[model samples]
Target: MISLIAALAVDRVIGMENAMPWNLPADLAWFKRNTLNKPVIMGRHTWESIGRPLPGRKNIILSSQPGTDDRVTWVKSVDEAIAACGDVPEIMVIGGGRVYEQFLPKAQKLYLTHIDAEVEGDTHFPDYEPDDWESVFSEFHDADAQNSHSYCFEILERR
Candidate 1:
């Protein structure tokens, strides 16, 4: 099954230039540990933002154009991505913007870290009605004690 993991702002902003807008070490660690040893599919821009393949996960780039690196598998369509994923128990649909919109409907689970603050961004999570999903889990995170921001980790399942 396909799953999506993203960190969003109060305004649902994800990023402006294909990179994370905030520094959350805990979130990064959670992402690394959760996605390790799995096949990760992302758009080309997201792949470029990381600059290299993730050590433990198989990286697949969803792009019309192919990359030069042998470590990164390039597929133009979502069908090809799912095919490449094979019988893997789970596949991660990481994103920049377009990639998320394309896969959200097919994804069984969505892991979102909802940030308390909003920042200007060029990329955003696609708008959908609340009835589209059911929130299965939610937990709030404190404002770092040092910073003014508060956040929540939410897991949603499609209804």
Candidate 2:
């Protein structure tokens, strides 16, 4: 099964120039807690931004120009990325924008940190049909010293 994880603004804005427009420590830690020890599939840009293989997890990068990096596996396409995981029960698709578009259709679950404020961004999370999804879990956080934006953590499963 494929699951996707992303943090986005009210406008679905995820990043500005390939990087997040805001910083939220609590949200970042939440991401690490959830994604650690999982096989994460990401696009070339996402890989570049991350800069190195994530420790304790398999890093699969979908890129046209595959590399011989033993630290992380590089695949030519999304199918190749999935194949690289080789029977893992669940693979996480972490993204930049375009990668999300490619993997969204295959994702059975979505883990989203929905920031309440809109911000400048060049990249965005894709829109999905709310009617097709059923909320499985949800929690809201008010902006605090550790987090700049009020946000809701929501998990949805396809209905």
Q: Pick the candidate with the highest TM-score.
A: 2
User: Model 2, stretches more than 4 Å misplaced?
Assistant: none
Model 2: per-residue Cα lDDT over 35-148, one tens digit each:
998899988888877788889889988888858576888889888889999987889999979999988899999999998887888888988888989999999999998887
Candidate 1 accuracy as lDDT:
0.85
State, as a TM-score between 0 and 1, how close model 2 is to the true structure: 0.95
Q: State how far residue 69 of model 2 sits from its true place (Å).
A: 3.5
lDDT of 1 by residue, 26-66 (tens): 67776887799999999988888989999888898988976
**After best superposition, candidate 1 residue 147: deviation in angstroms?**
7.1
Best by lDDT: 2
TM-score of each: 0.93, 0.95
Q: What are the Cα lDDT values of the candidates? A: 0.85, 0.88
